[PDB]
RNA sequence: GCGGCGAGCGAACGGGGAGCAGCCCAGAGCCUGAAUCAGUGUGUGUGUUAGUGGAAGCGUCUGGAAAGGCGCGCGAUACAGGGUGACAGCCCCGUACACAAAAAUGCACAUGCUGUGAGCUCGAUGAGUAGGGCGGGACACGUGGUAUCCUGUCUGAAUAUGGGGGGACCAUCCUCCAAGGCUAAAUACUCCUGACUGACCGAUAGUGAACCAGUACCGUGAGGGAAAGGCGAAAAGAACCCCGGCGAGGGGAGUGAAAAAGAACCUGAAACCGUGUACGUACAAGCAGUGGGAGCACAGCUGUGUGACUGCGUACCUUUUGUAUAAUGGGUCAGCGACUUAUAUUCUGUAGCAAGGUUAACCGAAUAGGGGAGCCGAAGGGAAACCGAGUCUUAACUGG
RNA sequence: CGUGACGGCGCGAGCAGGUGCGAAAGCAGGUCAUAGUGAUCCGGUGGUUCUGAAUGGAAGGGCCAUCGCUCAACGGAUAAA
């Protein structure tokens, strides 16, 4: 039958242009008051998927 | 396609039987057994094919010692009186000599002792 | 040229791997598995993504966004498609006519892509910066 | 490209892409091997370890008896067990693209007319369906073994050939791969000749 | 979309096909018996249940036997298949093709008989119901912001100037008419019957069962459940004689192509057990071989068999840092016994076509041809609206 | 640019806007530096030129800011042993 995507994994991934995958950093949902204000702007832009983890994420990504 | 196995499997325990002939007891009649012994008959050739060329020159010194020390030198005055004079004659040619022609082999001793002197 | 003189190109037909069917094969006894454990067994091996435990990858990182609805009727022309139509008037009915667009499309845009050479009448798409000056260059003309 | 008639002593023309082009061996294989595969019935099953009649009681407890441990009567590895990987009923049939076919086919009539084993005619027919009328038409033109495609089926003609083994009739429509091949010869009507350029194109 | 937003679960709208069919009661009047179905008779066809005809070959060689070899003929709308002393188009049974029913029966028409009511007009338009509160269930949808459906419990409308739905809800608009019912076809399956087919099995396989098998046997019972096929073309299955207990068994004779085809029967492997011959072996220490090697026997210096004496030498598998290991497994032989199959997806090879490539179901008598519904690709960026060879970020980029 | 398998974490001139101190050159994106911490999910609050299942709204969702864990067995199996 049909592989079945990881729906989780399609709610945090996108894939982009060449192939890779953009994604949303961790530690920007709540405790915030405490971190900087230039930690927290990093933050804010998507990121690429490294290249160790590409592996994994195209796993659960049949149909991306 | 089923494939039965009998006709092919019956030529492979034939093939290893076959080169267990002489062997003792199990060892010629039984497939289990007489293929360890056809193995182990292969590692012991493969040994001895090197083993072989050991044990003749050992032969062939020891023969060349025992006629040297009747002409009067030991084996090992010899060689280097063979080699000081340019003599190229190799062991298993030196103890066929000495064996079967006694003169040819003091014309040699005579040779060495001359170089050595 | 007989049914016992064809012969097929060489390299398009590799034989399979054959697991566990004597020393000389290089895939006899353990059968390229390896000795023991999880991924040895008949049946072993873990689930996708699973990390041995650690929290995995697509559950350590944030979801984000939303899905649109209506960017599932929206669809984009290239220049190249606009001489496929058939008759010189390009709209969203001529385009699913053409096959350039799916039935349930309703807002279509063309962008510089391709090259248009004929002049072709627009009509109730939405067009490029660029799109405009090639369609118009090659003699055409946009109606919203 | 001009086909050389043998009844009418003419000529007749064609396409060079049809019966001009180069013998693509890779393409004619596959499609041939396709063909054969399209041919097979596939019906077959044995007995998985589930469906071998018996029950499900273990033979033995699990220890202390001295034996091996055994947990089913029907276990492969058991006489009267079930078959390890029991075959299923399978459909073998392959996928040929439309333009591989189409272009095997031109590949196979370009070398049948490099090799000579091509023949045109313009009419090829006999009076009354009897076996005996073929045979002597076939042994006039020095053929045995052929393979007849004409434009229309002359209902004479196929009853004539039904009991000759080495015969064949059909029409343009009808004609398949490993036929043209298998055929010492291939007759063709002028008119089945025009029907097959149509059908390739 | 749902989801300890985990594991997993998973639509619809819309599109292409197969098939296609619509009606009645909640009611009176007119007009009438009109359509339509069901039954029962009778015809005509058409099957089913027995059947009939069905072409064409001889000579010679080998052989126990010819259908085989060789030579020369003949039939074919029949060279499907089976049999006959080895392999037969022409010996036999069939096959193609052409015919056949006293009687019973299926079907489709036709035509009777019976019941059924057709049409027009004017009316009527399903209440403890819809909806609601509480508890559950069903919907891809786990109460969630949750529409919709069902109802155990408690309630409860409007009724065409009315009501339901359009995914919380309201307005607007659109669309439909619940609380009565009937309805062919396309779809599912095969205990059973006939025909045909297989890159399915061929006696440890294939049904558990090729055979008097759901038997023998086991169990209080439910239930469990085997093993076991082959003389020969034909029984011509061995008259008679001899040893023996009026035995068993055997030797002759006879049959036969063959009896080491004799019924414990085709072939007749291996483990295992014997008889005969050659060589070795009763002062000699261990994985039993291997390298060297005398003597003897044999056949034509060599080939074969044997192997005194001598160097070296602690099986195999598994598992392990490491096994002669006193760790594991195997008494031996023969037969069987373990990386498969389907679908999806990615990469490599190869082939076709190429900015395009390819069809699915289905149609078709079609491995053809039709079918482009679709799917992938030629554009990306952004959460998105949106913009687009750019886009996002930001008030804006020297920028990223 | 450093440092991590990764999730991440760290150092950073310089640019735009607006600011404080200094006459000025300048310095300032917390504290001599290195500990003072908690992913995701689920939700809460405010904002918003995004979305809004016939349409206008709304609900809900997104985006930006922020809040809730001695999940301390501190890469955190469950809300619950
Ligand atoms: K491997
Ligand atoms: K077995
Ligand atoms: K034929
Ligand atoms: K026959
Ligand atoms: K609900
Ligand atoms: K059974
Ligand atoms: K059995
Ligand atoms: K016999
Ligand atoms: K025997
Ligand atoms: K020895
Ligand atoms: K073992
Ligand atoms: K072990
Ligand atoms: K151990
Ligand atoms: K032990
Ligand atoms: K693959
Ligand atoms: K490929
Ligand atoms: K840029
Ligand atoms: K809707
Ligand atoms: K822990
Ligand atoms: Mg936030
Ligand atoms: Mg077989
Ligand atoms: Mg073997
Ligand atoms: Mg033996
Ligand atoms: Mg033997
Ligand atoms: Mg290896
Ligand atoms: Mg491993
Ligand atoms: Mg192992
Ligand atoms: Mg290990
Ligand atoms: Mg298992
Ligand atoms: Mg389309
Ligand atoms: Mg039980
Ligand atoms: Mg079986
Ligand atoms: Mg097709
Ligand atoms: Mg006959
Ligand atoms: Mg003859
Ligand atoms: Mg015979
Ligand atoms: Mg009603
Ligand atoms: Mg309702
Ligand atoms: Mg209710
Ligand atoms: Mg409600
Ligand atoms: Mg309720
Ligand atoms: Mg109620
Ligand atoms: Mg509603
Ligand atoms: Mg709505
Ligand atoms: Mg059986
Ligand atoms: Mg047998
Ligand atoms: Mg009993
Ligand atoms: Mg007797
Ligand atoms: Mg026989
Ligand atoms: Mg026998
Ligand atoms: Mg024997
Ligand atoms: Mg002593
Ligand atoms: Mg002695
Ligand atoms: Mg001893
Ligand atoms: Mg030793
Ligand atoms: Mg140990
Ligand atoms: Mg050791
Ligand atoms: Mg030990
Ligand atoms: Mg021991
Ligand atoms: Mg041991
Ligand atoms: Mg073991
Ligand atoms: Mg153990
Ligand atoms: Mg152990
Ligand atoms: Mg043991
Ligand atoms: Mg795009
Ligand atoms: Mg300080
Ligand atoms: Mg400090
Ligand atoms: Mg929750
Ligand atoms: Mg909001
Ligand atoms: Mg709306
Ligand atoms: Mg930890």
Redesign the interface.
């Known amino acids: 039958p049909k592989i079945k995507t990881?729906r989780?994994?399609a709610?945090?991934?996108?894939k982009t242009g060449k192939g890779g995958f953009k994604?949303?950093?961790?530690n920007?949902?709540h405790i915030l008051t405490k971190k900087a204000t230039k930690r927290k702007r990093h933050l804010r832009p998507?990121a690429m998927?490294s290249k160790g983890?590409l592996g994994?994420?195209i796993?659960?990504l049949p149909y991306a | 396609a089923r494939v039965k196995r009998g006709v092919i499997a019956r030529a492979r325990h034939k093939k290893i039987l076959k080169q267990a002939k002489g062997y003792y007891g199990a060892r010629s009649r039984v497939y289990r057994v007489a293929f360890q012994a056809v193995i182990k008959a292969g590692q012991y050739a493969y040994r001895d094919r090197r083993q072989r060329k050991r044990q003749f020159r050992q032969l062939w010194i020891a023969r060349i010692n025992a006629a040297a020390r009747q002409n009067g030198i030991s084996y090992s005055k010899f060689i280097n009186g063979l080699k000081k004079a340019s003599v190229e004659i190799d062991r298993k040619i030196l103890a066929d000599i000495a064996v079967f022609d006694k003169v040819a082999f003091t014309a040699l001793v005579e040779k060495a002792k001359a170089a050595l002197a | 040229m007989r049914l016992n003189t064809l012969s097929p190109a060489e390299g398009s037909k590799k034989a399979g791997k054959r697991l566990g069917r004597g020393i000389g094969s290089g895939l006899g006894k353990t059968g390229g598995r390896g000795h023991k454990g999880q991924k040895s067994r008949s049946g072993g091996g873990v689930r996708?993504?699973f990390?041995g435990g650690q929290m995995?990858?697509?559950?350590?990182?944030?979801?984000?966004?939303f899905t649109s609805r209506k960017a599932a009727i929206t669809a984009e022309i290239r220049l190249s498609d606009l001489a496929k139509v058939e008759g010189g008037v390009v709209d969203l009915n001529t385009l699913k006519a053409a096959n350039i667009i799916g039935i349930q499309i309703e807002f279509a845009k063309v962008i510089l892509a391709g090259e248009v050479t004929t002049p072709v009448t627009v009509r109730g798409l939405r067009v490029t910066k660029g799109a405009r000056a090639a369609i118009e260059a090659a003699g055409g003309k946009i109606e919203e | 490209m001009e086909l050389v008639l043998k009844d009418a002593q003419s000529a007749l023309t064609v396409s060079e892409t049809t019966f001009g082009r180069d013998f693509n061996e890779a393409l004619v294989h596959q499609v041939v091997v396709a063909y054969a595969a399209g041919a097979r019935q596939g019906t077959r099953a044995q007995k998985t370890r589930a469906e071998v009649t018996g029950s499900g009681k273990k033979p033995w407890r699990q220890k202390g008896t001295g034996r091996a441990r055994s947990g089913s009567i029907k276990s492969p590895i058991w006489r009267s067990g079930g078959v390890t990987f029991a075959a299923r009923p399978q459909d073998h049939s392959q996928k040929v693209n439309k333009k591989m076919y189409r272009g095997a086919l031109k590949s196979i009539l370009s070398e049948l007319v490099r090799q000579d084993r091509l023949i045109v005619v313009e009419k090829f027919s006999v009076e009354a369906p009897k076996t005996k009328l073929l045979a002597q038409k076939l042994k006039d033109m020095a053929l045995e073994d052929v393979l007849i495609i004409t434009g229309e089926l002359d209902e004479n003609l196929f009853l004539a050939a039904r009991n000759l083994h080495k015969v064949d009739v059909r029409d343009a429509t009808g004609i398949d791969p490993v036929s043209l091949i298998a055929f010492d010869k291939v007759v063709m009507t002028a008119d089945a000749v025009k029907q097959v350029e149509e059908m390739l194109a």
Do not use: I, Q, S, T
């Open positions: 990881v989780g994994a709610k945090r991934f996108k994604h949303k950093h961790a920007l949902r998507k998927v983890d994994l994420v796993a659960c | 996708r993504g990390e995995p990858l697509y559950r350590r990182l944030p979801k984000f966004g």
